[PDB]
Amino acid sequence: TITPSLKGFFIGLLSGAVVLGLTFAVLIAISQID
Amino acid sequence: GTTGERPFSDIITSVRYWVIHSITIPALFIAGWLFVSTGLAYDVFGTPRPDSYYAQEQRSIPLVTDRFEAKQQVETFLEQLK
Amino acid sequence: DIDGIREPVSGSLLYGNNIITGAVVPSSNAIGLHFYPIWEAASLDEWLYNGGPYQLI
Amino acid sequence: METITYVFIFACIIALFFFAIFFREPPRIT
Amino acid sequence: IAQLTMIAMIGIAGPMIIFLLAVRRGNL
Amino acid sequence: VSYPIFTVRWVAVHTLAVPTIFFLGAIAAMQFIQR
Amino acid sequence: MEPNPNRQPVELNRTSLYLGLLLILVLALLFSSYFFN
Amino acid sequence: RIPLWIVATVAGMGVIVIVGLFFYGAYAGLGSSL
Amino acid sequence: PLGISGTFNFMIVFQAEHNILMHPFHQLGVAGVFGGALFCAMHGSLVTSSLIRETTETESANYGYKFGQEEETYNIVAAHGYFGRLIFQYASFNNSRSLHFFLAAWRVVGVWFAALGISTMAFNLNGFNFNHSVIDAKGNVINTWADIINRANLGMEVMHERNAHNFPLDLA
Amino acid sequence: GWFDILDDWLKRDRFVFVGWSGILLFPCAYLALGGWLTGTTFVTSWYTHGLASSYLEGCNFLTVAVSTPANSMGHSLLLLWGPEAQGDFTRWCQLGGLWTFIALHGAFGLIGFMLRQFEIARLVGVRPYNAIAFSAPIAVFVSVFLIYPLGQSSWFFAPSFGVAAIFRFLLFFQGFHNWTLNPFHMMGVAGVLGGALLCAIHGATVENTLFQDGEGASTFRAFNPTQAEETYSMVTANRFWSQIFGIAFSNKRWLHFFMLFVPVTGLWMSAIGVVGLALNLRSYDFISQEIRAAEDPEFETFYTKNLLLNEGIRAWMAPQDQPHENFVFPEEVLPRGNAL
Amino acid sequence: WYRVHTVLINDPGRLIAAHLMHTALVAGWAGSMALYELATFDPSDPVLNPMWRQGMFVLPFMARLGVTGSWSGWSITGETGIDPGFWSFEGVALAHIVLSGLLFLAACWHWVYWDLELFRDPRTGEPALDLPKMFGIHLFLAGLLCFGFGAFHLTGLFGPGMWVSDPYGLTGSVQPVAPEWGPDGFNPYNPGGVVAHHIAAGIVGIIAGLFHILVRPPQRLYKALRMGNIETVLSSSIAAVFFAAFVVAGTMWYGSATTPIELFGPTRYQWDSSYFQQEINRRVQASLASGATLEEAWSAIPEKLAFYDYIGNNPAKGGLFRTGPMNKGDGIAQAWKGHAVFRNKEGEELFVRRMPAFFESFPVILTDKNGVVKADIPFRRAESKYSFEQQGVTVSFYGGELNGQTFTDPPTVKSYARKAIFGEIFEFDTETLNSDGIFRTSPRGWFTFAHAVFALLFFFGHIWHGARTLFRDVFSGIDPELSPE
Amino acid sequence: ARRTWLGDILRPLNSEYGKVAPGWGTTPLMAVFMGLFLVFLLIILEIYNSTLILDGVNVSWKAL
Ligand SMILES: CCCCCCCCCCCCCCCCCC(=O)OC[C@H](CO[C@@H]1O[C@H](CO[C@H]2O[C@H](CO)[C@H](O)[C@H](O)[C@H]2O)[C@H](O)[C@H](O)[C@H]1O)OC(=O)CCCCCCCCCCCCCCCCC
Ligand code: CLA
Ligand code: CLA
Ligand code: CLA
Ligand code: CLA
Ligand code: CLA
Ligand SMILES: C=Cc1c(C)c2cc3nc(c4c5[nH]c(cc6nc(cc1[nH]2)C(C)=C6CC)c(C)c5C(=O)[C@@H]4C(=O)OC)[C@@H](CCC(=O)OC/C=C(\C)CCC[C@H](C)CCC[C@@H](C)CCCC(C)C)[C@@H]3C
Ligand SMILES: CCCCCCCCCCCCCCCC(=O)O[C@H](COC(=O)CCCCCCCCCCCC)CO[C@@H]1O[C@@H](CO)[C@H](O)[C@H](O)[C@@H]1O
Ligand SMILES: CCCCCCCCCCCCCCCC(=O)O[C@H](COC(=O)CCCCCCCCCCCC)CO[C@@H]1O[C@@H](CO)[C@H](O)[C@H](O)[C@@H]1O
Ligand SMILES: CC1=C(/C=C/C(C)=C/C=C\C(C)=C\C=C/C=C(C)/C=C/C=C(C)/C=C/C2=C(C)CCCC2(C)C)C(C)(C)CCC1
Ligand SMILES: CC1=C(\C=C/C(C)=C/C=C\C(C)=C\C=C\C=C(C)\C=C\C=C(C)\C=C\C2=C(C)CCCC2(C)C)C(C)(C)CCC1
C-alpha cells in the first residue's frame, strides 16, 4: 500500500477527472446560453 | 444547404484586422524566436546544445539502460559531459 | 545470364518451379544497350543464354 | 506438379477472360 | 553585405506597378 | 448582418494558428545557431 | 408444419461470378506457391 | 477594405520569404555539412 | 526484370544506388498513389453513401440504376451535405464535374512524377544525401535518421551483384 | 433535459461542425498532430536512438521525428507521472514520452474521428459507408503502431514519427522481414494501386464522357448542383472500353461501391500480414528453394539474390540501428561482395 | 449469398437451429481434432519432446483444466500408474463427439418446428423477442456456472484444480488453487488471482443477471439504441468477443498463468530476458561455489531446463509458412549435448554472441567477458584478424551428453560456435519425420496469430453490423426526397 | 403458433416485449458502475503494463 506509482495513479486519475470536470462543466455553461 | 456561417470570406481585408494583427503576428513571431534565442528550448525538452552530446572526450552514447529508474540514468548521464 | 559474368541466373517454372520466384530475365551486360535480335544468336540456344527473349518482348 | 499446377491456374485466367469479353451478358438500355 | 535589398526591390517593383495601375485605374 | 467574433469557428483557428506563427518564428532562431 | 414465408429466392447474376470466379481463381495463383512452399 | 488581392500577395511572400530563410539555414545552419 | 521477385530485386538495387526513397519525386508517386487510394475510398464511399431508395433489402441496393437512364442514381447535394459537414464546408466538393476530374488530377499528376523520378535517376540525379549532414561542435558526427537509412543501403549496396565487379566504384 | 441542452449546442451546424465526437475527436486529434510538431521541432531522441530528431538539432524536415523510446523501455506507456519519468515533462520528454503519447492520442483521435462520420451521416441522413470506409485506415494504423510493437520486443522497434523515420521502417522490413515477399502485403499493393487506377480510370473517364450542357469552352459552369440529371452518359463511355480494353461497366451504383472495396479492401489485407510480423511469423523463405539451393552452387533465382540483399541490408544496419543490443561487428565478419 | 443468411433476422425458429448447428460443428470439430491431435502426440517423452514441441493445438488446453490422464495408460506428467476415469483425453474427445451428433439431432427440430407457441408476442399477432429479458437470464446463468468455477473446480472443493508450475518449466502439474484477492490476486501469473476472479465476477455476474432479468430498459436507451432489433445485440457482442479475443492472443505472447509454459511454449520474452540463462547459471554458481567441479556443476542443471534456453523453442523464430510442429524444423530433440565454453591459447573464456529474434541468420562472433571481440568466423578471409584458428579457439563441454570432452580441430570447434548462436546445443533426430531445418513457431505463438486476424476482422463489422443497427432505415436507400440541409 | 409442453412454461419470459421504462430513468446508476469499471480495467492495465508497481506484486512467472 502507498507505493510511489499507486500515488501517481491516483494523481493521474484526478487530472483525468480534472479535465473531465472542467471540459464538461464549461460545455453546459455554453449549452444553456442559447 | 443551411449555413450558420460567420464572416470569414473577407475578414483578412478587415480594416481593423490587419491592424490589431500588424501587432499580434510579429509579437508572436519573436515571442517564440526567443524561446529559441534564449536557449530555453533546450532546458525545456532537454535537447542538447551542440556541445552537449558526447562529453568533451568519451565516445559512448547515453543510451537509457534500464526501465524503472531511467531518469536516474539520464541524471548522471547528463551531469556527465560537464 | 543477366549480369555479364557467365553465371546464369534462371528463375522460371520448368526450372524455378514457382510463381513468385521465376520471371523473365533481362539482357546480359555483354551485349549492352546493343540490339540483340533473335536472328543474331548463332543458335536459338545462344539467343537464350543471353536474355534474348527478354528484349523482343 | 506445381510447374503444372501453376500453368493451369493461368490457362484458366485466359479462359475466364475469353468468357467475359464475349459471353458478357449485354448491358440493356431501358 | 546583403543585396537582399535588390531582390526585394526588383520584387516589389512589378507587383506594385499593378497597385499604381489599379489605384490610377487602367484597364488591366 | 449581425455577426460576432468570439465564435467556435474562431477558437479552432486560434488553436493551431498562433502556436504555429510562434513555431515558424522560433525556427529562424533555429537556423542561425552553430558550432 | 405449413411452408415457410421467410424463404425468398436465392440471388446471383451471370457476371457476379465473372467478378468472383476471377478473384478466387487469381487469388489462387498468388496464394498457391506459398502453399507449395 | 484593404484590396483582397494585396491581402494575398503580401502573404504569399510570407511563406515565399520564410521558406527562403529556411532554405538558407540548410547551407550554414546547425544542420549544415560543415 | 519481369517477374514478381525480380521486381523487388530491381527495386532494392535501385534504392541502394539512388536514394530513391529519399526523393521528392518518388514522394509524388506515393503522394498521389497514396492519395488515389485515399480518394478512391471517398467518391466510392460518399457516392454509395448517397443512394435514393429503390428496393428495401428485398434484393440489393445496387439496382437503383438501370443502365442508360439519364438520371443519376446517387444524390449530389445529398452527398456534399455530408462531407461539407465532416470537414467544414468549402472543403467538400459542390460541383460534380470539378470532382471526377480531380480524380485523374491526383493519380496521373504524381504517377507521372514518379515515372520521371526513375527516368531522372537513369542519369544519376538521385534522392537527397544527408549522410552525416548534422554535425557536432568538436566535429563528432551526430546521426540523422537518414543516416540509418544509409546502412540499410550500404548493406544492400555491397552485396548486390557480388562477384560481378572487380573495382571499388559502381558507376552503373 | 439538461442532457439535450449540451447536446443542443454541440451538434449545431457551426462553420466546422463540432459534435459529441468533438469531445474525443478534437482534443486527442490535437495534441497528436500537435505533439508530433512539438517534438519535430524541439525534442531529441538522442537518449533512445542517440540520433537527432528536432529541427533545433540541425535536422532536416525529412530527417526529423519523435523517435520511439529506447527498447530498454518495453511497452510501458511512459506516462508523464509514469514511474519512468516519475512525473517530469523535461525528462519524460527525453525518455521519448511523446511517442506512446502521439500514438495513443492519435489512437483516440482516429477513433473519435471514425465516430465523427457515424455522427454526421446519421444527422444529415446517409448510409454509413464513409465511416465504414475508415476501417481500412484504423486497421493499417492499428496493425503498424500497436499490435506490431506489442507482439515484438520494444515500443522501440515500432515506426517512428517522421519521414526518413518511416522510410527506415520500410528498409527495416525488407531486411530482417522481407515483407515484399508476403502474399498479404502483395495485396495491399493490389489495393493501393488499383484503387488509384480506379480513382483515375474513372476520374478522367468522366472528364472525357460528359456533354455540352453549358456554353463556353470550359466545363466549369456546366450543370449542377444536383439539378439536370447526370453529366456523363454511362452508355457512350461504356462502348468505349467494351471495345478498347474489352470490358466496361454498367450501373454507376456498383462502380461506386467497387471503388470503395478495392482500396479499403486490399489495405485491410496487409494489416493482417503485419500482425504476422509481430510474432516474426512472416513470409521469408520458400523451403522448396533453400534446400534445392543448398546442394547446388549452380542454381540462382532472383529469390536468392533478393535474399542476399537482406543479409547485407542487415549486417551493416542492425548495429547502429539497434544500439541497445551492443552489436560488435568486426570488419571481416561483415558480408559483402567482391571488390565492394 | 451476400444476404443469403438474412432469412433468420426475425423468426427465432429456424434461427436457433442455426446456432444449434454452428454449435455442433464446433464441438463436432472438438474431439475430432483431439482424436487427430491425440492420434499423433507421441507421449513417450515430456522433457525434450513436450506436447508443445510437436505442434499440438487442442491437447494443451485439456491439461490446463485437468484432464491429463489417457486411456492409453500414460499422462502428460511422466507417471504411468494412474488414469482418471471417463475423463481422459479419450472421453473428453469422445464426449464432444457424441455432443455434436447429439446437438445436430435437435438442431433439426427447430427448422421444421419454426412456428412455435411461446415464439410470438401475445398482445400482437406477430413474432418477437424480449431481448433485455433473455439477456437477463443468459447473463445470470453465465454468472452461476462461472462462480462455481473457482468455487469447486479450480479450488478442488469438487474437481481438478488446474495446471500450475513453478517459475521455470520443471515441476508443472495439475493441482487445486485457493483464491487470493489481496493485490497479488491480480498478477496474470498468480493462479489464485484467477480462481478468486471466477468466484468474484461469477457471484457478480449473478447479481447483474437478476437485476437485468427484473428491471426494465429505460426508454432513452431502448429508443436510442435500436434494441428490439436482434441486429443490435449482434454488434453489442461482436465487440465483446473481439475485445476478449485480443487479450487471449495477448496472454499467450506475454507471460500469463492461464498460458503455462510447459503447456504451450516458452515466452518469446524468455529468450529476450535471457531468462533461463541467468538461472541455469546461478545454479552452476551455487553448486560450483559449494563442494563441486566445473564438470560436476552443469551436470546438475537438468535437461528440461537446458532445453528451454534454446532458441528453437522460442516461437519468435517461426515464419508464416513453416507448416507444422516445431519438430519438423530443427529435428526431434533427442538429448542435451552439454554446455560448452570456448577458450584459446591464452585460455580466456570467450563467449559466443547470440542470435536474437529478427535475424534468421547471424555471424558467429566471440567476445570474452568485458565484451571485447576475441575470435569470429570471418566471411572475408584475407585480412582476417580474429578468425578462429589464428587465435585458435577450442570448446569444452561440461555436463550434458558430450561432457568431459574438449574439441580442438578448427572445423569442429567452428561448428560448435555455429550451433552455439542458438543457445544451448542439443542433438536432434531429424530423420524420423524428415526434418527440414527451419525451426517453426510454437502453438503458444500460433494461437497468438489467429486471435489476430480473427480479432482484427471482428472489430471491423462490429462497425458494419453496428451500422446496420443504427441505420436500419437508410440502407435500402436514403429518402428520395430531402430539401437543402 | 403450435402448442408445446416446455413451451407454455417458457413465455411470459418471452412475452413482455417492448417492456420500455420511464425516460432514460435508470441510466445514471448504470454509467456509475462503468466509471468504476473503466477505471478498473485501467488499473490492471497499468499494473500489467508495468507502470503501477504495487506492494508485494511481482508481475513475473516468479509468482509462487
Ligand atoms: C484489429 C482491430 C483493431 C481495433 C482498433 C481499436 C482501437 C482502440 C485502441 C485502444 C487500445 C490501445 C491501447 C492499449 C495499450 C495496451 C498496453 C499494453 O500493450 O501492455 C503491454 C504489457 C505487456 O507486458 C510485457 O511484458 C513483457 C515480458 O513480461 C515478463 O518478462 C519476464 C518474462 O520472461 C518476467 O517474467 C516479467 O516478470 C514479465 O513481466 C515485456 O516486459 C514487455 O516489455 C511488456 O510490454 O502489458 C500486458 O500485459 C499486455 C496485455 C494486453 C492484452 C493484449 C491487448 C493488446 C493486443 C496485442 C497483443 C497481441 C500480440 C500481437 C500478435 C498479433 C496480433 C493479432
Ligand atoms: C457473428 C455472427 C454473424 C452473423 C449471424 C452474421 C450475419 C451476416 N453478416 Mg456478418 N460479420 C460478422 C458476424 C456475423 N455476421 C463478423 C464477426 C464480421 C467482421 C466485421 C462480419 C462482417 C460482415 C460484412 C462485411 C458483411 C456481413 C454481412 C452479413 C449478412 C450477409 C448475409 C449473410 O450472412 O452472408 C453469408 C453468405 C455467405 C455466402 C457466407 C460465405 C462467405 C464466404 C466467402 C466466407 C468464407 C468463410 C468460411 C468459408 C469460413 C469461415 C470461418 C471463419 C470466418 C470463422 C448476414 C446478416 C453482409 C451483409 O450484407 O449482411 C447481409 C456484409 O457485407 N458481415
Ligand atoms: C500515420 C501517420 C502518417 C502521416 C501523417 C504520414 C505522412 C506522409 N507520408 Mg507516410 N507512412 C505511414 C504513416 C504516415 N505518413 C506509415 C504507417 C507507413 C508505412 C510504411 C508510411 C509509408 C510512407 C511511404 C513509402 C511514403 C510516405 C510518404 C508520406 C508523405 C507523403 C504524403 C502523401 O503522399 O499523401 C497524399 C495526401 C493524402 C493522402 C491526403 C492528405 C495529405 C496529407 C495529410 C497532407 C500533406 C501535406 C503536408 C503535411 C504539409 C504540406 C503543407 C501544405 C499542404 C499546406 C507524408 C508526409 C511519402 C513521402 O516520401 O513523404 C513526403 C512516401 O513516399 N509514407
Ligand atoms: C456443457 C458445458 C461444457 C464444458 C464443461 C465444456 C468443456 C470443454 N470443452 Mg466444450 N463446448 C460446449 C460445452 C462445454 N464444453 C458447447 C455447448 C460447445 C459448442 C458445440 C463446445 C465446443 C467445444 C470445442 C470446439 C472444443 C471444446 C473443448 C472443451 C474442452 C477444453 C475447452 C476449455 O477449456 O474451455 C475454455 C472456455 C473458456 C475459457 C470460457 C471462455 C468463455 C468466455 C471467456 C466467457 C464469456 C462470458 C460472457 C461475457 C458473459 C459475462 C460473464 C459474467 C459472469 C460477467 C473442455 C473439456 C475443446 C476440446 O475438446 O479440447 C480437448 C475444443 O476444441 N468445446
Ligand atoms: C475502431 C474503433 C471503434 C469504432 C469506430 C466504433 C463504433 C461504434 N461502436 Mg464500438 N467498440 C469499440 C471500438 C469502436 N467502436 C471497442 C474497442 C469496444 C470494446 C467493447 C467497443 C464496444 C461497443 C459496444 C457495446 C457498442 C459499440 C457500438 C458502436 C457503434 C455505436 C456506439 C459507439 O460507436 O461507441 C463508441 C464507444 C467509444 C468511442 C468509447 C468511448 C471512448 C473511450 C471510452 C475513452 C476511454 C479511454 C480513456 C482515456 C482510458 C485511457 C486508455 C489507456 C489504455 C491509455 C459505432 C458503430 C454500439 C453499437 O454499434 O451497437 C449496435 C454498441 O452497443 N461498441
Ligand atoms: C467453462 C467452465 C468449466 C469448464 C470448461 C469445465 C470443464 C471441465 N470440468 Mg468442470 N467445473 C466447473 C466449471 C467448468 N468445468 C465449475 C464451476 C465446477 C464446480 C463444481 C466444476 C466442477 C468439476 C468437477 C468435480 C469435475 C469437473 C471436470 C471437468 C472436466 C471434465 C468434463 C469433460 O471434459 O467432458 C465434457 C463433455 C461434454 C461437455 C460433452 C457435451 C455433450 C455430451 C453428450 C454430454 C451429454 C451426453 C448425454 C446426452 C448425457 C450427458 C449427461 C450424462 C451422460 C452424464 C472438464 C470438461 C471433471 C474432470 O475430471 O474432467 C476431466 C471433474 O471431475 N468439473
Ligand atoms: C497515405 C497516408 C494517409 C494519410 C496522410 C491519410 C490522411 C487522412 N485520411 C482521412 C480520411 C480517410 N482516409 C480513408 C481511407 C484511406 N486512407 C488512407 C491513407 C492516408 N490517409 C488509405 C490509402 C485508405 C484508402 C485505401 C477514409 C475514406 C477517410 C476518411 O473519410 C477521412 C477523410 O474524410 O478525409 C478527408 C483524413 C481524416 C483526418 C483525420 O482522421 O483526422 C483525425 C485525426 C487527427 C487529426 C490526429 C492524427 C491521428 C494520427 C494517428 C496521429 C499521427 C500524427 C503524426 C504521425 C503525423 C504524421 C506526420 C509525420 C509522421 C511525418 C486525413 C486527411
Ligand atoms: C506550393 C505549395 C504546393 C503544395 C506542396 C508543397 C510541399 C512543400 C513541403 C515542404 C515541407 C517542409 C519544408 C522544408 C523547409 C525546411 O527545411 O524547414 C525545416 C522545418 O520545416 C517545417 O517546419 C515543415 C513545416 C510543416 C509543418 C506543418 C504540419 C501541420 C501544421 C500546420 C498547421 C497550420 C495552422 C527546418 O529547416 C532546418 O533549418 C535548420 C534548423 O533550424 C537546419 O540547420 C537545417 O537548415 C534544416 O533544414
Ligand atoms: C495472368 C492474369 C491474371 C490476373 C487478372 C488480370 C487483371 C484483371 C483486372 C480486371 C478486373 C476488373 C473487372 C471490373 C469489374 C467490372 O465492372 O466488369 C464486370 C465483370 O467483368 C470482368 O470481370 C471481365 C474480366 C476479364 C477482363 C480482362 C480483359 C483482358 C485484357 C483486355 C485488353 C484489351 C486490349 C462486368 O460488369 C460488372 O458486373 C455487372 C453485372 O454483370 C454489373 O453491371 C457491375 O456493376 C459491373 O459493371
Ligand atoms: C453422427 C451422429 C453421431 C455423432 C456424430 C458426430 C460425432 C459427428 C461429427 C462430426 C464431425 C465430422 C465434425 C466436424 C466438423 C468439423 C469441421 C467441419 C470443421 C471445420 C473445418 C474447418 C474450420 C476448416 C478448415 C479451415 C481451413 C480450410 C484453413 C483455415 C482454418 C479453417 C478451419 C477455416 C452419434 C452417433 C454420436 C449420435 C448422433 C448422430
Ligand atoms: C505538445 C503538447 C501539448 C499540445 C501540443 C500542441 C499544441 C502541439 C501543437 C502544435 C502545433 C500547432 C504545431 C504546429 C505547427 C506548425 C508548423 C510549425 C507549421 C508549419 C509549416 C508548414 C508546413 C509551412 C508551410 C508550408 C507551405 C506554405 C509550403 C508547403 C506546405 C507547408 C504546410 C509545409 C500539451 C500541452 C497539450 C501537452 C504537452 C505536449
PDB file of N, CA and C in Angstrom, chain H residues 13-30:
ATOM      1  N   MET H  13       4.198  35.974 -49.791  1.00  0.00           N
ATOM      2  CA  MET H  13       5.599  36.310 -49.743  1.00  0.00           C
ATOM      3  C   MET H  13       6.047  35.788 -48.392  1.00  0.00           C
ATOM      4  N   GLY H  14       5.136  35.820 -47.425  1.00  0.00           N
ATOM      5  CA  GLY H  14       5.447  35.356 -46.087  1.00  0.00           C
ATOM      6  C   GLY H  14       6.001  33.954 -46.120  1.00  0.00           C
ATOM      7  N   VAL H  15       5.365  33.078 -46.883  1.00  0.00           N
ATOM      8  CA  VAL H  15       5.860  31.717 -46.996  1.00  0.00           C
ATOM      9  C   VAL H  15       7.052  31.768 -47.948  1.00  0.00           C
ATOM     10  N   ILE H  16       6.831  32.386 -49.112  1.00  0.00           N
ATOM     11  CA  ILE H  16       7.844  32.553 -50.151  1.00  0.00           C
ATOM     12  C   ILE H  16       9.129  33.150 -49.584  1.00  0.00           C
ATOM     13  N   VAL H  17       9.019  33.936 -48.522  1.00  0.00           N
ATOM     14  CA  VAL H  17      10.206  34.543 -47.947  1.00  0.00           C
ATOM     15  C   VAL H  17      10.731  33.749 -46.761  1.00  0.00           C
ATOM     16  N   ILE H  18       9.835  33.218 -45.931  1.00  0.00           N
ATOM     17  CA  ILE H  18      10.281  32.460 -44.766  1.00  0.00           C
ATOM     18  C   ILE H  18      10.929  31.149 -45.170  1.00  0.00           C
ATOM     19  N   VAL H  19      10.349  30.479 -46.158  1.00  0.00           N
ATOM     20  CA  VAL H  19      10.897  29.222 -46.637  1.00  0.00           C
ATOM     21  C   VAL H  19      12.268  29.481 -47.275  1.00  0.00           C
ATOM     22  N   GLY H  20      12.499  30.748 -47.610  1.00  0.00           N
ATOM     23  CA  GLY H  20      13.754  31.171 -48.204  1.00  0.00           C
ATOM     24  C   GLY H  20      14.822  31.276 -47.133  1.00  0.00           C
ATOM     25  N   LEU H  21      14.422  31.646 -45.924  1.00  0.00           N
ATOM     26  CA  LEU H  21      15.364  31.687 -44.823  1.00  0.00           C
ATOM     27  C   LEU H  21      15.636  30.248 -44.504  1.00  0.00           C
ATOM     28  N   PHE H  22      14.563  29.482 -44.488  1.00  0.00           N
ATOM     29  CA  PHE H  22      14.642  28.073 -44.184  1.00  0.00           C
ATOM     30  C   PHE H  22      15.655  27.443 -45.118  1.00  0.00           C
ATOM     31  N   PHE H  23      15.447  27.622 -46.413  1.00  0.00           N
ATOM     32  CA  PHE H  23      16.360  27.031 -47.364  1.00  0.00           C
ATOM     33  C   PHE H  23      17.806  27.521 -47.247  1.00  0.00           C
ATOM     34  N   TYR H  24      18.027  28.677 -46.634  1.00  0.00           N
ATOM     35  CA  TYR H  24      19.401  29.151 -46.457  1.00  0.00           C
ATOM     36  C   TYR H  24      20.029  28.387 -45.287  1.00  0.00           C
ATOM     37  N   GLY H  25      19.343  28.419 -44.141  1.00  0.00           N
ATOM     38  CA  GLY H  25      19.810  27.761 -42.923  1.00  0.00           C
ATOM     39  C   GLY H  25      20.244  26.318 -43.094  1.00  0.00           C
ATOM     40  N   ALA H  26      20.101  25.835 -44.326  1.00  0.00           N
ATOM     41  CA  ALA H  26      20.463  24.479 -44.706  1.00  0.00           C
ATOM     42  C   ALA H  26      21.813  24.501 -45.420  1.00  0.00           C
ATOM     43  N   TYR H  27      22.370  25.699 -45.553  1.00  0.00           N
ATOM     44  CA  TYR H  27      23.654  25.870 -46.206  1.00  0.00           C
ATOM     45  C   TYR H  27      24.687  26.490 -45.254  1.00  0.00           C
ATOM     46  N   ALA H  28      24.304  26.630 -43.985  1.00  0.00           N
ATOM     47  CA  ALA H  28      25.192  27.190 -42.967  1.00  0.00           C
ATOM     48  C   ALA H  28      24.697  26.892 -41.557  1.00  0.00           C
ATOM     49  N   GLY H  29      23.460  26.407 -41.468  1.00  0.00           N
ATOM     50  CA  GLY H  29      22.849  26.104 -40.183  1.00  0.00           C
ATOM     51  C   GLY H  29      23.617  25.189 -39.251  1.00  0.00           C
ATOM     52  N   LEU H  30      22.888  24.576 -38.328  1.00  0.00           N
ATOM     53  CA  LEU H  30      23.487  23.635 -37.394  1.00  0.00           C
ATOM     54  C   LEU H  30      23.437  22.314 -38.184  1.00  0.00           C
TER      55      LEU H  30
END
